[PDB]
């Protein structure tokens, strides 16, 4: 539908970038093709496809319409053979918006290098959950997304915190709009497991070792969440929802031009959710507001300012698990899926807010620059109280552990980068060069010295959460942890031949953890990034990459000598083939990857047996560890109204002990999510289903009362989702999702501090969405 245009004749480059903006569409073109060319005038309200053919008039250029992207090409009657991965500059530095693409495969992406590249161009495993996927499958928060993300396994620490493994590792790398947060521990990290999907276009997950743009982080993966953006045409929707266990949700999303010309624009969202659960006495209100204003200082300088805010506010939160495995005498406990060992008043509320600003500028060059400022708060308020220990006892009584943690973390980030093309041996290449600084400050209070509490209860079998609330007494501890991260990075992408793209970069890193622990310091650390992509046909490419990452150890991971262990460090080695079809409407990837860890913190038993250095009392050892496996995925259009996303991941990870590690992460996993839009009589109907399988997994947990280690197993299980949607009316639709159709009862945690969590039983969600 028609858009308001005004692009005066100028370099075809500026015109192409000015078009991308005014049209909310991403424009890709080759620098050396548009250089000495100029665009013809376009003026007025217009349909975008008329607009571009009108803009290119006189220029030799053609247009490949590609959903939210158009790519401009200029054909020659020469054409010696084709350069499919030729260097292409790009109007949207985050890549292609997925909203209204109607697809499950992503458009372009810059998760890997800061350079906008398509998944066939990206020489690392990159999986993306697209805006429409989130819509069709009910994926309302990051937990729901991860569960539906190929290669990811979500396991539970407690009601208010989950865990995401990839390739043998706990992911601790989150970004927002490509900006790393600090996530050293749960301190800095409040509400990361919980982000609402309402403010986002999509979450892109880079799996492997992602040091280059993450800086210091964990192995396995980065989860980069991309924010929703304002647009030039007015539009929004209102959505209202209702599912199993008094789970109710509203959501408002509004966006467009805020002045007659269009040079300031805004988008706003609020969503609210209040739900109980299968688990007894658990309930949880979340609120989310977001707001973004875009200003065009002038047509090649844009200033963006905005804020978001989320509060997660639960009741009956548990600390660890849903109930304890063994009782007082050592027998495995057997309890309803509703059992919830947290107190009625127990809360692990976790909150988040961001004030940010960006300036982005286009240089005559066709080079573009961007400055990003972030102020971020992660807060928690956790007066927790639950049953732990080896309970119940023969007489049915049990004991509460109740402690209270409050705190807040304030962050500031500046990031700057410059991106552009450049000629070298008579071919076109691109470079990114960036610098970044983050300072972040955790300040907390703890309470364990409880005045005059009687923490026993007289009925385990009927635990209602109905216990007293203690006198927290005075603070027990005061936290003060300041991290400082600086880094500078560089990648070049050489178009070496018409089939070979060579990727060369690094990041140099400075990292300081200051406060109540002895200082932790790592200076001038270098993180390599070497990769290549060789084209085989119009369809298939092979790629191989070598990527690195490290993370300075927690202060409490010292050795025999009482020396902080050296940074936890990894190299992902990856070789693979990617396939592309139907003009990028469908994508396939088959990969073999390997991970080499070093300094994986490990207890050190011989020593801990009997402390001899009185300096340390419980020392660790840094060992090596190795992850080997392969992965296949597919995403996009299988036929005309028929989308899938599917994956298959295999891994084993062992350490120098030889023994398997991360054994709760299954060794083999599988995801297939599909929907179909009929045509003709039924063309208002959309039908959807999905399955996720994973094989055997387990923990060794120690039955204390019996004085022996036991293995707990979760037998391989399927989970099936079903989905239908009918568009009754132009402006109004009604959906239903049913998850876990066969009501499979399984475990999402066995073994976390000797407890267990059950996965969601069958649940339905009903909703209507209304578009103005
Ligand atoms: C220092 C704090 C920075 C916070 C920035 C937050 C900005 C919040 O502003 C919300 C703007 O949203 C714009 C809503 O867009 C709706 C467009 O419709 C306009 C009215 O339509 C009239 C006839 O169509
Ligand atoms: C352990 C218990 C789980 C129960 C399992 C139930 C699964 C079967 O449910 C089938 C759902 O079909 C009901 C169809 O209702 C249609 C919904 O229409 C939406 C209304 O929108 C109103 C618009 O204003």
Swiss-Prot record:
GO terms for molecular function: siderophore uptake transmembrane transporter activity; signaling receptor activity. Residues 233-772 form the TBDR beta-barrel domain. Belongs to the TonB-dependent receptor family. Gene3D superfamilies: 3.55.50.30, TonB-dependent receptor, beta-barrel domain, TonB-dependent receptor, plug domain. A motif (TonB C-terminal box) lies at residues 755-772. Keywords: Cell outer membrane, Ion transport, Iron, Iron transport, Membrane, Receptor, Signal, TonB box, Transmembrane, Transmembrane beta strand, Transport. One of its GO terms (cellular component) is membrane. The keyword tRNA processing does not apply. Residues 118-228 form the TBDR plug domain. InterPro entries: Plug_dom, Plug_dom_sf, Secretin/TonB_short_N, TonB-dep_rcpt-like, TonB-dep_rcpt_b-brl, TonB_rcpt_b-brl_sf, TonB_rcpt_CS, TonB_sidphr_rcpt. Receptor for the siderophore ferripyoverdine. It is found in: Cell outer membrane. PANTHER family: FERRICHROME IRON RECEPTOR-RELATED, HYDROXAMATE SIDEROPHORE RECEPTOR FHUE. CDD domains: ligand_gated_channel. The gene is fpvA. It holds the Pfam family STN. This is Ferripyoverdine receptor. It is a multi-pass membrane protein.
């Amino acid at each position: 539908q028609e858009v308001e245009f005004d692009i005066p004749p100028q370099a075809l480059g500026s015109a192409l970038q000015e078009f991308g903006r005014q049209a909310d569409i991403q424009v890709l073109y080759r620098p050396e093709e548009v250089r000495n060319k100029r665009s013809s005038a376009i003026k007025g309200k217009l349909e975008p496809n008329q607009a571009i053919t009108e803009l290119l008039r006189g220029t030799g250029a053609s247009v490949d319409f590609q959903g939210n992207a158009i790519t401009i090409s200029v054909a020659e009657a020469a054409d010696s053979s084709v350069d499919l991965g030729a260097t292409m500059i790009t109007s949207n530095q985050l890549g292609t918006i997925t909203e209204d693409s109607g697809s499950y495969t992503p458009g372009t992406i810059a998760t890997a290098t800061r350079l906008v590249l398509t998944p066939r161009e990206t020489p690392q495993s990159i999986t993306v959950v697209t805006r429409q996927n989130m819509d069709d499958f009910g994926l309302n928060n990051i937990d729901d997304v991860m569960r539906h993300t190929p290669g990811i396994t979500v396991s539970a620490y407690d009601t208010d915190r989950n865990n995401y493994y990839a390739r043998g590792f706990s992911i601790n790398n989150f970004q927002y709009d490509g900006i790393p947060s600090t996530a050293r521990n749960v301190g800095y990290s409040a509400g990361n497991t919980l982000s609402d999907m309402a403010i986002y276009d999509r979450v892109e997950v880079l799996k492997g070792a992602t040091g280059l743009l993450t800086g210091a982080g964990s192995l396995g993966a980065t989860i980069n969440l991309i924010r929703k953006k304002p647009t030039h045409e007015f539009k929004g929707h209102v959505e209202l929802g209702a599912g199993s266990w008094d789970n109710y949700r509203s959501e408002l999303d509004v966006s467009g031009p805020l002045t007659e010309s269009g040079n300031v624009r805004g988008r706003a969202v609020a969503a609210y959710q209040d739900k109980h659960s299968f688990m007894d006495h658990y309930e949880r209100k979340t609120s989310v507001y977001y707001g973004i204003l875009e200003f065009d200082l002038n047509p090649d300088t844009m200033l963006t300012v905005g804020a978001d805010y989320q509060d997660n506010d639960p009741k009956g939160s548990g600390w660890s698990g849903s109930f304890p495995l063994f009782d007082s005498q050592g027998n495995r406990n057997d309890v309803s899926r509703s059992f919830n060992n947290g107190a009625k008043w127990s809360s692990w509320e976790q909150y988040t807010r961001t004030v940010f600003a960006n300036l982005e500028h286009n240089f005559a060059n066709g080079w573009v620059g961007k400055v990003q400022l972030d102020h971020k708060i992660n807060g928690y308020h956790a007066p927790l109280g639950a049953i732990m220990g080896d309970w119940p006892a023969p007489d049915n009584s049990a004991k509460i552990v109740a402690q209270k943690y409050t705190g807040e973390t304030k962050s500031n980030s500046l990031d700057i980068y410059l991106t552009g093309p450049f000629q070298f041996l008579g071919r076109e290449h691109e470079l990114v060069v960036g610098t970044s600084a983050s300072f972040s400050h955790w300040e907390g209070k703890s309470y364990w010295n409880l005045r005059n509490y009687d923490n026993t209860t007289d009925d385990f079998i009927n635990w209602d959460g109905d216990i007293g609330k203690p006198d927290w007494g005075t603070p027990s501890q005061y936290i003060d942890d300041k991290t400082r991260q600086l880094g500078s990075y560089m990648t070049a992408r050489f178009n070496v031949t018409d089939d070979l793209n060579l990727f060369l970069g690094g990041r140099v890193v400075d990292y300081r953890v200051t406060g109540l622990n002895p200082t932790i310091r790592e200076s001038g650390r270098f993180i390599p990034y070497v990769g290549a992509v060789y084209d085989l046909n119009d369809t298939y490419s092979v790629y191989a990459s070598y990527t690195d990452i490290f993370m300075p150890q927690d202060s409490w991971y010292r050795d025999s000598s009482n020396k902080l262990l050296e940074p936890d460090e990894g190299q992902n080695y990856e070789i693979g083939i990617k396939g592309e079809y139907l003009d990028g409407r469908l994508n396939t990837s088959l990969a073999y990857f390997e991970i080499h860890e070093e300094n994986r913190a490990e207890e050190d038993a011989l020593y801990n047996s009997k402390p001899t250095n009185p300096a340390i009392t419980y020392a660790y050892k840094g060992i090596k560890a190795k992850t080997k496996g392969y992965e296949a995925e597919i995403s996009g259009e299988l036929a005309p109204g028929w989308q899938v996303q599917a994956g298959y991941t295999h891994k084993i990870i062992r350490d120098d002990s030889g023994k398997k590690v991360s054994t709760w992460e299954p060794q083999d996993q599988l995801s297939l999510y599909t929907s179909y839009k009929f045509k003709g009589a039924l063309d208002k109907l959309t039908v959807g289903g999905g399955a996720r399988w994973q094989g055997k997994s387990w923990q060794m947990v120690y039955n204390n009362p019996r004085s022996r280690w036991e293995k707990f197993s979760q037998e391989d299980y399927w989970l099936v989702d079903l989905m239908a949607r009918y568009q009754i009316t132009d402006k109004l639709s009604a959906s239903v999702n049913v998850n876990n159709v066969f009501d499979k009862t399984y475990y999402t945690n066995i073994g976390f501090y000797t407890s267990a969590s059950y996965g969601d039983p069958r649940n339905l969600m009903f909703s209507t969405r209304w578009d103005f």
